[PDB]
Design brief:
Radius of gyration: 15 Å
Entry title: Solution structure of the second Bromodomain from human Bromodomain-containing protein 3
Shape: globular
Number of helices: 6
CATH topology: Histone Acetyltransferase, Chain A
Helix content: 55-70%
PDB class: dna binding protein
CATH architecture: Up-down Bundle
Assembly: monomeric
Name: Bromodomain-containing protein 3
Largest sheet: none
CATH class: Mainly Alpha
Keywords: Bromodomain, Bromodomain-containing protein 3, RING3-like protein, Structural Genomics, nppsfa, National Project on Protein Structural and Functional Analyses, RIKEN Structural Genomics/Proteomics Initiative, rsgi, DNA binding protein
Strand content: under 5%
Distance between the termini: 17 Å
């Protein structure tokens, strides 16, 4: 769609939300939105007790698939997942981690958007 995400098989709100995600997946926000572009493999990676701290991990790629299959019953469900994705980074990574400053930049946008809707 151009200058407007033509709804379709989506809740009055969802239809709009579906976009909020397509935006966060832009090369522009990537600078601080990439931290959630690739998956996480404790086995392969040399992480340190990843699962331990983060029991229910999340990632952009994940939320998308869910939104693609209309898995979300409403806007709440969709947004919910997104919220977690952040809380995770803010939990796993320390308060001195640069990634923490980047994530925010995204969250700030994810908030206003949801509001404008």
């Amino acid at each position: 769609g151009s200058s407007g995400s033509s709804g379709g098989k989506l809740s009055e709100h969802l239809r709009y939300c579906d976009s909020i995600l397509r935006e966060m997946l832009s090369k522009k926000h990537a600078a601080y939105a990439w931290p959630f572009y690739k998956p996480v493999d404790a086995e392969a990676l040399e992480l340190h007790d990843y699962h331990d701290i983060i029991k229910h991990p999340m990632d952009l790629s994940t939320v998308k698939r869910k939104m693609d299959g209309r898995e979300y019953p409403d806007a709440q469900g969709f947004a919910a997942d997104v919220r977690l994705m952040f809380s995770n980074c803010y939990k796993y990574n320390p308060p001195d981690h640069e990634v923490v400053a980047m994530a925010r930049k995204l969250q700030d946008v994810f908030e206003m958007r949801f509001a404008k809707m």
